[PDB]
Amino acid sequence: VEHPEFLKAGKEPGLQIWRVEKFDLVPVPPNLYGDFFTGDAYVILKTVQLRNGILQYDLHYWLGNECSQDESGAAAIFTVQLDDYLNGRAVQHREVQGFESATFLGYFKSGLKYKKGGVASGFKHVVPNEVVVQRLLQVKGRRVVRATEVPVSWESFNNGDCFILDLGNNIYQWCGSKSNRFERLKATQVSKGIRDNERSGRAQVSVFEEGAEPEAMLQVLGPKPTLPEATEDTVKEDAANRKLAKLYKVSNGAGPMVVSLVADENPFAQGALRSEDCFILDHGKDGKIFVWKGKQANMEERKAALKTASDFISKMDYPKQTQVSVLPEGGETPLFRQFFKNWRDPDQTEGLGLAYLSSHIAHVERVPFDAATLHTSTAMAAQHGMDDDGTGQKQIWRVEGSNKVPVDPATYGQFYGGDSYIILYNYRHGSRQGQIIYNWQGAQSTQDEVAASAILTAQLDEELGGTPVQSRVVQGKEPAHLMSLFGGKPMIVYKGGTSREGGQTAPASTRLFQVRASSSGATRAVEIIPKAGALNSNDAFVLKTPSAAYLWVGAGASEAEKTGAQELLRVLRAQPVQVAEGSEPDSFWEALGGKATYRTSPRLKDKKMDAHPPRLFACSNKIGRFVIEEVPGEFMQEDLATDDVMLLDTWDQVFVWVGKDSQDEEKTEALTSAKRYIDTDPAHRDRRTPITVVKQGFEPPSFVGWFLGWDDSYWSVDPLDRALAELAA
Amino acid sequence: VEHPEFLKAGKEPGLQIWRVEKFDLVPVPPNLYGDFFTGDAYVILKTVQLRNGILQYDLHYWLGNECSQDESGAAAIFTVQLDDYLNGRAVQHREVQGFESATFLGYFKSGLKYKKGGVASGFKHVVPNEVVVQRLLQVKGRRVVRATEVPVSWESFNNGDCFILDLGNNIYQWCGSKSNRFERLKATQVSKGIRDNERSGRAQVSVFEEGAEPEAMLQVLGPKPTLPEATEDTVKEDAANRKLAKLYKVSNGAGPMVVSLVADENPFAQGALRSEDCFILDHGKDGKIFVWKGKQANMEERKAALKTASDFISKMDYPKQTQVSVLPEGGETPLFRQFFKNWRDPDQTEGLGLAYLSSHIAHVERVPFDAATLHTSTAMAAQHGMDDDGTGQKQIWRVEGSNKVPVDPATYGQFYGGDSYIILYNYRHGSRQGQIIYNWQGAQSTQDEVAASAILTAQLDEELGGTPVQSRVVQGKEPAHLMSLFGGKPMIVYKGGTSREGGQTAPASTRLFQVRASSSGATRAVEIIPKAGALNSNDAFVLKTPSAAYLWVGAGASEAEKTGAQELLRVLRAQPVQVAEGSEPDSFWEALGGKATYRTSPRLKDKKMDAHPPRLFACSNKIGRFVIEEVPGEFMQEDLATDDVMLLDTWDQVFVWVGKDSQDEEKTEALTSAKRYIDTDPAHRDRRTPITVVKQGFEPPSFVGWFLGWDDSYWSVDPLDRALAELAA
């Protein structure tokens, strides 16, 4: 028999929600998704279509604060058995009211609603036509909006939040005198939602500010007293730097839980993961633990994973609200993978996408690079980091002491690791035109000149109007677009000295050049330390020597690498010796110091977006404290608070968006915020990661391309006035 | 027409209630009577059928606390115009939330319900069947129960009152730890009311006490905190003594209200009421004022009476909640004329009911006395103050010093004003049997002996089991039952001296004896000072002069007064000379000190109950002061709280009922409270009014007869446990 709802579950892409009622699954009306009774438990199944057409499942069970143990028990039981019915391939999530995951919150753009009552109280999700209602909702949140039913009284109020007095046919939105316009904008979406989803469009919504309360409101609440200040410390976040985690091994029936340390500090090795066991990725310091199930683990402890996680949270004395995710071997999520050195799937060198696809990007089309059509697609710009083809007008300066000195035009494309340069580029991309200032910092540039280049960069931006895009690039991690500014020649980077008045230092004895190519066909030749154990099967290298030139071409190489590899030889003034990987003369091996171990890690080209999906966060340095809050769901322009500083974390680059009305001391710390963000990432990513500062209204193509609903005129009119113009119309 | 709802108004006995909605009268569902929204105004019409078949109208308009001036204005307009439609024969009342008059409150025994909202907020009474409810009701009140809708939060609770969590199909009644069993009983009525009148009996109600809150309750309220004490500022009723009042004349062209004093202190003279004007009886101290309208007052001033009342209240600086009643000349009520000394009706000496019948006794059937069936009816006992025919066993003692001296059996029936007596009597009334102790105190008895008689009276009551009825009577104000103790012989009372040993005193040469008869037929001859201006046409008189003895029989006299007067002559051993009112020989007049004024006014031997309806109150001395609270509506055994001291005030006598669980000080102070009650009465009634102390479970026939549903077993089982059996069943 197995239960009738299971037969409807996960049959096609979408969202399904059931409430557990007396050990039974009862469908919640689709128009009411987002509403959860505080004393109930729910089961939420999200189905996504992977790129190969296969279906992916995210199973969450939600627990209200006033929820008992028999109900939450029934929920955990259903999650387990439902996962089994779906062939144990679902990722499982335990969500607790007020602390649910970003994945979960992303499913409700309109926001969440916490209602008083539940099954034990005889309440149900029902919105008949003729209905009598008298409830008060307190709206809180900037990135994730939560509307909680509170007692209908002045005592529930404060002057900082917005409240909604729902009287049925009349919906009164009230916002405190100290409420921010963005918050009121959000409050309005909840009110509109009630009008449209409940009531079905047949209801009047009127918005009011403190001090202008209507008669209706005054009638049921009574005369307005003096109001309190909002308690910002409701759940004030202060998770500055939390990048550490531990890996445990577990084996238990459900009671005799044996836990043993396996890794005291991430990055963890993918090897520590054994298919015969279950592991617990402990990231509790950031309120989240992962339970990993090996594909050959016993059925008894597989079906006890949820309980196991609980016992772990107890024995570790963690808050009950800790976030829990259980993943099956082979179906690991990006958030889990990020904790390991170099995660390589032994069945993903081919195929389409990965075994998992983050919900917030499942709807994004993967557009391949096409130089000829690039200027007509912001999506392409964003996916390949190319604001334009790179053939626009540019100026290149070297920093000498404290001044900008023009670089000899004939030298363009050539850079010396002993200096720091600044580049002004004018880009043209149909939809937009602008400038980009690149600040390149050579690994051997002296501190004073590096510091001087940053300042000169900021000053150029300012004497240009504060309109340009500002990007900080470090030698070694040059971004794709910077690479394509030199016709078809690879960007050459000598780890050598300067190139000013007179360097004379460069033509050493044995130099090695690594030629890496980008999605846009762009290439760059970088000099490193001559050693076998530094080669890469993908890109192609060039080994200079007093004998001859070795044009080593790795098996994983291609057109772009080779072509660019040799164009370097012409510059170096030498004749190569095309040598294919594996079969290379021992003459080559000696010009490195032996013959160590290669590096055959296949670059996640297309799979890049899948393994490291982009994430959007909000920045706050307020009171010497650095805090970041992620904004869930599909990226929307509406989420960009003009008084905030946002971070669009691409994997290959970090964008920092600064709102027109943010504070001066925060837009000045833009770059610093990005660095703090990057030095804090649990993934322990390269600190050289390029950083790009964008200004509201002058966002580049590779930025907007990530937002499908992008409209330049969006800020021509105050969004809140726009919103207000819809309700009362 | 004037209004289609006016056509349905007061056509037959009953209660009609309209809610004022946007200047219109909208009928309230009868099963919801008692329910009132705080932001609205209402019009209530009580129609009582008089004894002569005619209809009587009590028109009230009730104003909620969050009610607007226009809605309240509309209600007053409708009251005035509805009175006009009813040919201005109605008595109008202004009722304010929380301070309604006893008359109004008497229409709702189950209690009053103050709901949140009103027309401005879009609320209605007419509510569909399938409805989703979630409300909290706070119930306060001992005599009059008021349940107020409050926010659904623990913040609304206290450990003293009871609260009802109305969740629809289930009603949860919670009572604080410090709640009285009587209050719980009262709260239970509201719960059953909600289940029966709302929900159509289709609901479950559970009763719980603090500490045992159920799951459904904790689910919507959250965990229970530590609750506060209840504010005992019930009202403080700081009006221990309010017997003073003033009478003003109010002449106003329209707005210029000219107020002028016409009677500084009450009693007032009925002749002060001139049909050409409007008067204001001021009893603000006790929170009430009446406006009297002359039958020949200007139409422009009658239709302005309500406004005139308001202006008076603001001018005199009284509280806005002050109760206001406006009545028409000829349509006065008992509470109004009680302020006037000797009130008379033009053409009512012939009839039944002085044009006004108090709602709480409208259903009581008048039953004429009949010794043959007395023992068969408690109603007859109560209405005639006869616990039985008075042929029971008795013992009479005269108090001498500190001792009870048995009276000479052959003297039984003769009382001397210089003594005090104690009479122990055994009554037999089909329904029950018991004992009564009469303490007769003579007007010329010395303080020590008067004092000693009270103590000995209370002492006898105690050593007899605290079971007898205890009655204090003063010479000249003998109660009917006491007069019947002496066979057919009348109770002879000489203002004389003593009947003890050495006591030759008071043998005056000329003596006058007024021979009165009671509705029951008993009679008493009271020695009065010999003056013509002391005669009364209603009863017979005996004049004893040294020369002769006269038997003066007034025109109103009956066979009862004559037989009593001659039975007296017989005791004085004098041969009578009968004379009839009208032909008084000059010897008669010259003996009385010369002919003088008279007193031929007839008595209320039937309309007595109409002119002075019985009233029930509760007593207390909370903070050293004396407070009385009236219990509205029809007298009911359930309103007799076993831990209270009640006053059943007929006009003839004052019954003081002592609950078995009242404080020792309270039942020891019974008599004092009663006297205190009489000394404070506005009516300025005789300070000699008999007082009768009654004990719980031993109430005499003349007391229980006032309660139409008396059950002698009612206290066998605790009422709360009894009632808890009707709801939890």
Side-chain angles (χ1 to χ4, degrees):
Chain A
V1 198
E2 56 194 19
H3 200 303
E5 291 307 302
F6 284 27
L7 304 183
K8 304 174 189 178
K11 295 300 174 174
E12 58 199 286
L15 180 61
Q16 288 166 303
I17 301 188
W18 298 269
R19 179 202 188 198
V20 182
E21 322 195 346
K22 297 170 186 176
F23 205 10
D24 195 25
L25 298 172
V26 190
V28 170
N31 45 300
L32 297 180
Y33 285 0
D35 288 5
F36 295 97
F37 281 105
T38 285
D40 284 335
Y42 296 70
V43 170
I44 300 83
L45 171 57
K46 169 69 178 184
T47 296
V48 167
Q49 185 178 69
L50 296 180
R51 302 182 57 200
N52 55 21
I54 301 299
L55 295 182
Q56 164 190 308
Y57 307 112
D58 278 285
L59 243 176
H60 318 233
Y61 61 121
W62 185 93
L63 311 169
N65 287 165
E66 313 302 339
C67 175
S68 76
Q69 177 274 304
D70 261 54
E71 298 295 0
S72 56
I77 291 168
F78 279 129
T79 304
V80 166
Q81 308 187 326
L82 213 187
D83 170 59
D84 187 18
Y85 177 80
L86 296 170
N87 303 309
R89 59 169 57 184
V91 183
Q92 306 179 296
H93 307 282
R94 172 173 167 272
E95 313 284 0
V96 178
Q97 184 190 328
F99 304 83
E100 42 286 272
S101 64
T103 304
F104 185 76
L105 300 171
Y107 307 147
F108 318 93
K109 267 299 183 180
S110 306
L112 254 54
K113 215 182 290 172
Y114 297 158
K115 308 166 62 55
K116 297 268 263 189
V119 179
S121 308
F123 294 121
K124 52 193 65 183
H125 293 289
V126 75
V127 289
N129 294 293
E130 313 179 68
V131 184
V132 183
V133 54
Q134 177 177 296
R135 62 168 174 182
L136 210 234
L137 297 130
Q138 176 178 190
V139 183
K140 236 159 170 58
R142 201 176 180 81
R143 359 254 45 142
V144 26
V145 332
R146 298 184 165 80
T148 304
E149 285 180 349
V150 290
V152 174
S153 148
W154 276 121
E155 298 189 58
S156 303
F157 284 76
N158 66 50
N159 58 33
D161 306 330
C162 291
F163 296 72
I164 299 164
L165 183 67
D166 173 24
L167 278 346
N169 293 173
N170 282 288
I171 308 179
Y172 299 93
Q173 185 177 302
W174 178 105
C175 292
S177 50
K178 296 199 61 180
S179 72
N180 200 298
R181 303 183 75 69
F182 193 69
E183 285 164 355
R184 303 181 206 164
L185 177 62
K186 289 301 178 181
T188 301
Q189 296 193 301
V190 179
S191 297
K192 183 172 304 177
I194 301 171
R195 182 193 69 184
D196 297 339
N197 301 313
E198 302 181 80
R199 323 306 153 71
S200 301
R202 314 183 66 278
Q204 183 74 5
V205 177
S206 54
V207 61
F208 297 98
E209 288 180 55
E210 167 174 24
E213 29 290 299
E215 186 185 8
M217 177 160 197
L218 248 28
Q219 190 165 73
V220 342
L221 296 168
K224 167 181 145 58
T226 289
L227 304 183
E229 284 285 308
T231 298
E232 188 62 58
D233 302 7
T234 296
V235 186
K236 72 170 181 181
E237 303 177 302
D238 276 286
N241 311 59
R242 306 303 175 182
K243 58 185 293 182
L244 297 176
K246 298 177 181 175
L247 185 57
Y248 296 90
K249 169 192 174 59
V250 61
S251 296
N252 66 299
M257 182 177 85
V258 185
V259 186
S260 40
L261 196 75
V262 181
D264 192 18
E265 193 174 1
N266 62 119
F268 303 122
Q270 173 163 26
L273 262 39
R274 312 267 295 182
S275 291
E276 299 69 47
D277 312 303
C278 287
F279 295 70
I280 287 180
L281 190 317
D282 185 3
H283 193 45
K285 301 306 178 186
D286 201 29
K288 191 182 193 70
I289 69 169
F290 296 84
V291 176
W292 192 84
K293 302 178 298 177
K295 71 178 180 181
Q296 291 172 180
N298 195 199
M299 165 193 77
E300 292 202 56
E301 56 175 48
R302 188 202 314 294
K303 277 172 155 50
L306 252 28
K307 193 177 181 303
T308 302
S310 295
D311 300 358
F312 180 78
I313 289 182
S314 292
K315 185 178 299 177
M316 291 303 284
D317 190 47
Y318 288 152
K320 304 188 303 173
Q321 40 284 104
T322 301
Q323 279 167 31
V324 181
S325 292
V326 322
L327 340 186
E329 173 173 11
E332 303 82 358
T333 60
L335 284 178
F336 179 78
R337 287 154 54 100
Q338 73 174 309
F339 287 106
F340 301 70
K341 285 290 185 179
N342 293 60
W343 190 286
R344 307 160 297 169
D345 292 312
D347 196 296
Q348 298 295 168
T349 305
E350 294 283 352
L352 283 169
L354 299 177
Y356 193 92
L357 180 64
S358 300
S359 262
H360 66 114
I361 52 164
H363 57 81
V364 176
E365 295 178 56
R366 303 293 215 280
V367 47
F369 191 87
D370 193 281
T373 38
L374 172 63
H375 66 73
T376 195
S377 181
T378 54
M380 188 192 289
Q383 285 175 48
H384 297 288
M386 300 282 296
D387 288 311
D388 75 358
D389 45 56
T391 64
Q393 306 259 56
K394 68 174 179 295
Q395 294 183 53
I396 300 185
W397 291 279
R398 181 181 50 254
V399 175
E400 291 187 7
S402 57
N403 327 84
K404 295 200 298 291
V405 186
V407 176
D408 190 312
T411 323
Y412 281 18
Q414 280 173 277
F415 296 101
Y416 293 81
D419 323 312
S420 292
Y421 310 81
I422 158 175
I423 302 157
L424 182 57
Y425 178 74
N426 301 288
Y427 76 77
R428 281 83 69 166
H429 178 286
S431 58
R432 296 178 180 58
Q433 296 181 177
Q435 303 178 292
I436 302 173
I437 306 180
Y438 283 111
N439 181 194
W440 189 82
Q441 285 164 34
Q444 263 135 292
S445 188
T446 57
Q447 281 308 310
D448 63 299
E449 284 191 344
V450 171
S453 66
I455 293 170
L456 288 171
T457 293
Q459 259 176 42
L460 174 56
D461 171 272
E462 175 157 291
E463 83 182 3
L464 229 49
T467 288
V469 165
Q470 197 178 304
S471 189
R472 172 194 118 314
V473 51
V474 182
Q475 172 176 47
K477 268 300 172 186
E478 298 64 32
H481 186 69
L482 174 52
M483 292 179 248
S484 77
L485 294 176
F486 317 108
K489 288 68 179 180
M491 197 185 108
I492 325 291
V493 173
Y494 312 90
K495 64 178 284 63
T498 185
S499 70
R500 64 198 69 189
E501 56 174 58
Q504 296 183 57
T505 300
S509 57
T510 313
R511 317 168 68 183
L512 219 203
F513 283 75
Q514 183 183 304
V515 193
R516 186 167 170 169
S518 67
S519 305
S520 52
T523 59
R524 65 192 175 66
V526 189
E527 185 179 0
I528 55 183
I529 303 298
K531 287 200 302 180
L535 303 175
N536 187 297
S537 195
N538 291 76
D539 37 62
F541 305 58
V542 175
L543 181 51
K544 158 66 180 55
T545 201
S547 303
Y550 291 62
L551 187 71
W552 198 75
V553 47
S558 299
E559 157 64 295
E561 354 286 299
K562 297 196 295 285
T563 174
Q566 57 185 61
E567 183 67 10
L568 170 65
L569 279 306
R570 177 191 289 182
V571 177
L572 292 172
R573 281 276 181 173
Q575 187 61 185
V577 184
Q578 280 72 298
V579 46
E581 170 173 43
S583 51
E584 335 89 307
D586 53 297
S587 305
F588 165 102
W589 281 141
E590 276 197 62
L592 298 178
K595 177 182 181 296
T597 302
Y598 281 106
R599 207 309 174 65
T600 311
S601 297
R603 296 281 173 53
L604 302 171
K605 181 176 184 178
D606 193 335
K607 281 71 182 309
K608 173 176 55 186
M609 194 169 125
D610 297 282
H612 297 107
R615 302 171 67 176
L616 187 56
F617 304 82
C619 275
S620 300
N621 284 184
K622 302 177 184 178
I623 315 301
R625 171 65 78 174
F626 179 73
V627 76
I628 64 169
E629 204 199 312
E630 167 162 37
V631 21
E634 314 158 300
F635 301 139
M636 302 190 83
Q637 178 173 32
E638 303 65 61
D639 289 319
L640 269 25
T642 71
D643 65 326
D644 273 307
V645 170
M646 311 296 278
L647 290 188
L648 208 207
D649 177 9
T650 279
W651 182 252
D652 279 336
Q653 162 186 46
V654 180
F655 279 96
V656 45
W657 186 87
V658 303
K660 199 216 294 179
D661 317 311
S662 51
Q663 190 163 181
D664 270 40
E665 61 179 64
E666 290 207 306
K667 57 178 70 176
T668 288
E669 300 302 297
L671 278 167
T672 304
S673 304
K675 291 170 186 177
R676 289 206 189 84
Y677 170 83
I678 296 177
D679 290 317
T680 289
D681 197 307
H684 293 202
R685 21 209 300 212
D686 184 52
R687 288 177 51 175
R688 301 174 307 169
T689 298
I691 295 186
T692 309
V693 179
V694 164
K695 295 69 169 295
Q696 181 190 308
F698 306 91
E699 299 90 348
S702 61
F703 180 83
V704 311
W706 285 119
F707 296 73
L708 281 67
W710 194 282
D711 176 54
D712 309 77
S713 301
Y714 184 75
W715 294 297
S716 63
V717 46
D718 184 56
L720 174 51
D721 291 327
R722 196 209 315 294
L724 248 51
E726 288 215 0
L727 293 301
Chain B
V1 182
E2 297 299 300
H3 195 112
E5 285 305 309
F6 281 17
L7 307 180
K8 309 152 66 186
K11 291 293 210 58
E12 56 190 298
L15 182 71
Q16 291 169 300
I17 302 177
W18 291 276
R19 185 211 203 177
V20 174
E21 293 171 40
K22 290 188 187 306
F23 209 6
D24 184 35
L25 293 170
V26 179
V28 177
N31 61 299
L32 294 181
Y33 282 2
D35 270 30
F36 289 103
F37 283 100
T38 285
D40 295 337
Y42 297 65
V43 176
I44 297 78
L45 175 58
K46 175 60 172 171
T47 302
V48 169
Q49 188 160 61
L50 292 187
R51 302 187 66 186
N52 61 16
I54 302 295
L55 297 183
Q56 168 194 289
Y57 302 121
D58 274 285
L59 230 173
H60 317 226
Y61 65 106
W62 179 98
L63 307 170
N65 284 175
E66 312 302 350
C67 178
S68 71
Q69 68 299 301
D70 279 328
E71 282 139 47
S72 52
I77 295 175
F78 276 136
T79 295
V80 172
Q81 281 162 30
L82 184 43
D83 173 55
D84 196 21
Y85 177 72
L86 299 172
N87 312 306
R89 300 158 304 186
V91 173
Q92 304 173 304
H93 306 278
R94 181 171 168 269
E95 310 292 359
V96 175
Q97 191 194 314
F99 304 81
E100 302 81 346
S101 70
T103 296
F104 181 73
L105 296 173
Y107 308 154
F108 319 100
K109 276 295 197 172
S110 307
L112 251 27
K113 214 178 291 154
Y114 299 162
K115 304 170 67 50
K116 274 264 191 293
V119 180
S121 297
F123 292 99
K124 300 181 178 182
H125 284 286
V126 187
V127 177
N129 288 189
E130 297 175 55
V131 180
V132 184
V133 332
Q134 187 196 307
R135 56 174 182 168
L136 223 218
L137 292 161
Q138 179 174 193
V139 46
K140 298 179 78 69
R142 206 176 181 69
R143 348 258 62 128
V144 46
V145 180
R146 299 181 169 80
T148 299
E149 285 183 355
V150 289
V152 176
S153 164
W154 276 117
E155 289 290 78
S156 302
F157 290 69
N158 61 54
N159 57 40
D161 305 342
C162 294
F163 298 71
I164 303 171
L165 187 53
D166 192 5
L167 259 21
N169 285 163
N170 286 283
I171 302 167
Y172 298 91
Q173 181 180 313
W174 185 101
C175 287
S177 59
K178 287 197 171 180
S179 70
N180 228 321
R181 292 184 75 77
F182 189 58
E183 260 79 31
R184 298 181 204 158
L185 176 60
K186 290 308 173 194
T188 299
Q189 293 298 5
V190 184
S191 291
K192 185 180 176 182
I194 298 177
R195 179 203 67 193
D196 288 346
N197 309 318
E198 283 176 277
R199 316 306 151 61
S200 314
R202 305 178 68 279
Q204 185 71 63
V205 20
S206 306
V207 184
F208 303 100
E209 297 183 300
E210 169 170 33
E213 29 289 312
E215 181 173 55
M217 199 172 148
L218 295 187
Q219 191 174 71
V220 342
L221 293 172
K224 184 176 77 65
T226 24
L227 306 178
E229 277 291 309
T231 303
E232 186 171 54
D233 278 352
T234 307
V235 50
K236 245 58 184 177
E237 307 289 48
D238 290 301
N241 317 299
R242 307 301 182 179
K243 59 177 298 182
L244 300 182
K246 295 166 183 177
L247 178 49
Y248 294 83
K249 186 175 73 64
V250 58
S251 291
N252 57 301
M257 183 176 90
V258 179
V259 61
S260 51
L261 191 65
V262 317
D264 190 15
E265 190 173 302
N266 58 117
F268 303 134
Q270 163 159 44
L273 271 43
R274 297 215 311 175
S275 304
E276 303 78 51
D277 314 301
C278 283
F279 297 75
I280 290 184
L281 184 335
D282 179 2
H283 199 198
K285 289 296 196 303
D286 202 21
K288 168 60 165 294
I289 68 169
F290 312 67
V291 331
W292 187 79
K293 304 182 303 174
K295 63 162 55 187
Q296 299 173 182
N298 186 191
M299 172 198 90
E300 305 182 62
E301 280 187 55
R302 286 207 299 285
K303 281 191 169 58
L306 256 6
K307 186 184 174 176
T308 296
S310 299
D311 286 353
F312 181 80
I313 290 177
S314 86
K315 179 161 297 183
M316 294 305 271
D317 204 52
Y318 292 135
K320 296 188 301 178
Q321 36 287 152
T322 306
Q323 314 180 320
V324 176
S325 284
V326 20
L327 33 176
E329 167 173 356
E332 306 81 355
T333 60
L335 298 173
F336 177 75
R337 54 197 178 196
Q338 93 180 312
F339 288 93
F340 301 78
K341 180 70 74 178
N342 187 49
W343 183 289
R344 188 205 297 171
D345 276 54
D347 285 64
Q348 275 309 301
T349 299
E350 301 281 351
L352 304 174
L354 294 178
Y356 190 81
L357 185 68
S358 297
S359 200
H360 66 108
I361 64 172
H363 67 86
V364 177
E365 284 181 56
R366 295 280 189 301
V367 40
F369 184 84
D370 186 54
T373 55
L374 177 58
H375 63 57
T376 223
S377 168
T378 61
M380 186 184 281
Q383 286 169 39
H384 294 289
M386 293 286 285
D387 289 316
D388 78 350
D389 58 50
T391 62
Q393 292 271 65
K394 66 175 166 301
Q395 170 68 51
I396 305 189
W397 290 277
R398 175 177 53 256
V399 171
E400 299 176 8
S402 55
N403 301 147
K404 278 183 294 175
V405 183
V407 161
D408 195 294
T411 308
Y412 273 39
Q414 281 162 265
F415 297 85
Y416 294 77
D419 299 320
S420 275
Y421 305 87
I422 299 180
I423 306 172
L424 172 54
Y425 179 77
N426 278 10
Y427 75 81
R428 327 170 168 184
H429 188 278
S431 57
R432 75 206 61 223
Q433 312 136 182
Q435 303 171 293
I436 298 174
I437 303 170
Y438 285 109
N439 179 198
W440 193 83
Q441 308 178 333
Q444 295 173 182
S445 185
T446 58
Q447 284 310 294
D448 55 317
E449 288 188 342
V450 168
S453 72
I455 295 168
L456 289 173
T457 291
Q459 208 170 73
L460 181 67
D461 168 7
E462 176 182 16
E463 57 208 17
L464 227 40
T467 290
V469 165
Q470 198 190 314
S471 186
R472 164 194 136 310
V473 4
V474 180
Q475 169 173 35
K477 263 293 191 177
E478 290 75 18
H481 190 65
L482 174 60
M483 284 155 62
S484 328
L485 269 35
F486 319 93
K489 275 54 183 177
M491 178 183 303
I492 306 285
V493 31
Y494 316 103
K495 67 177 182 61
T498 179
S499 59
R500 68 193 70 193
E501 291 308 340
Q504 289 176 57
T505 298
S509 65
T510 303
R511 315 171 72 186
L512 185 53
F513 286 95
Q514 166 161 32
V515 183
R516 237 191 175 200
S518 58
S519 62
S520 56
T523 58
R524 66 180 147 105
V526 184
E527 185 165 357
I528 302 302
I529 176 177
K531 289 180 180 173
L535 292 179
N536 190 296
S537 186
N538 294 147
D539 27 80
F541 289 66
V542 166
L543 182 49
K544 167 72 175 54
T545 61
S547 308
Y550 300 99
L551 170 45
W552 187 84
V553 48
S558 303
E559 202 64 293
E561 7 273 304
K562 297 180 188 178
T563 179
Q566 46 185 43
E567 192 59 58
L568 199 207
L569 264 347
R570 199 168 310 167
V571 176
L572 303 174
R573 298 191 178 184
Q575 213 53 62
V577 180
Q578 185 176 304
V579 323
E581 176 176 44
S583 54
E584 300 87 301
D586 282 297
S587 302
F588 182 108
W589 291 124
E590 189 176 300
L592 246 52
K595 175 191 169 189
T597 310
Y598 244 60
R599 206 289 172 164
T600 316
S601 310
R603 289 166 176 163
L604 307 165
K605 319 149 191 172
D606 252 300
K607 296 185 284 64
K608 180 181 188 176
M609 193 173 127
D610 300 287
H612 305 99
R615 303 172 70 190
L616 184 62
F617 298 77
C619 291
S620 184
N621 309 70
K622 179 168 65 68
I623 302 303
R625 206 59 50 177
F626 179 63
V627 50
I628 62 167
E629 173 169 48
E630 181 174 19
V631 15
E634 302 160 1
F635 307 142
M636 306 198 106
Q637 183 158 11
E638 308 81 67
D639 298 309
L640 266 39
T642 69
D643 68 321
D644 252 320
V645 174
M646 316 296 281
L647 290 181
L648 204 201
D649 174 4
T650 301
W651 197 238
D652 301 305
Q653 63 186 312
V654 173
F655 281 104
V656 41
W657 185 91
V658 318
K660 188 209 299 184
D661 298 301
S662 42
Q663 295 183 305
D664 240 43
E665 325 174 329
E666 283 287 307
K667 60 184 67 181
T668 213
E669 227 70 306
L671 280 182
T672 315
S673 298
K675 276 186 289 184
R676 175 77 169 188
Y677 166 85
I678 295 175
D679 292 325
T680 304
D681 195 294
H684 286 202
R685 37 206 300 202
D686 206 319
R687 315 182 76 282
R688 295 178 299 169
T689 306
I691 298 175
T692 300
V693 175
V694 163
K695 267 71 70 170
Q696 185 186 318
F698 299 97
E699 305 80 359
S702 56
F703 172 87
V704 312
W706 284 113
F707 303 73
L708 231 58
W710 198 271
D711 169 33
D712 294 79
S713 316
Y714 183 84
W715 288 294
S716 306
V717 47
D718 180 76
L720 180 61
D721 300 325
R722 180 213 302 294
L724 240 37
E726 275 220 24
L727 274 287

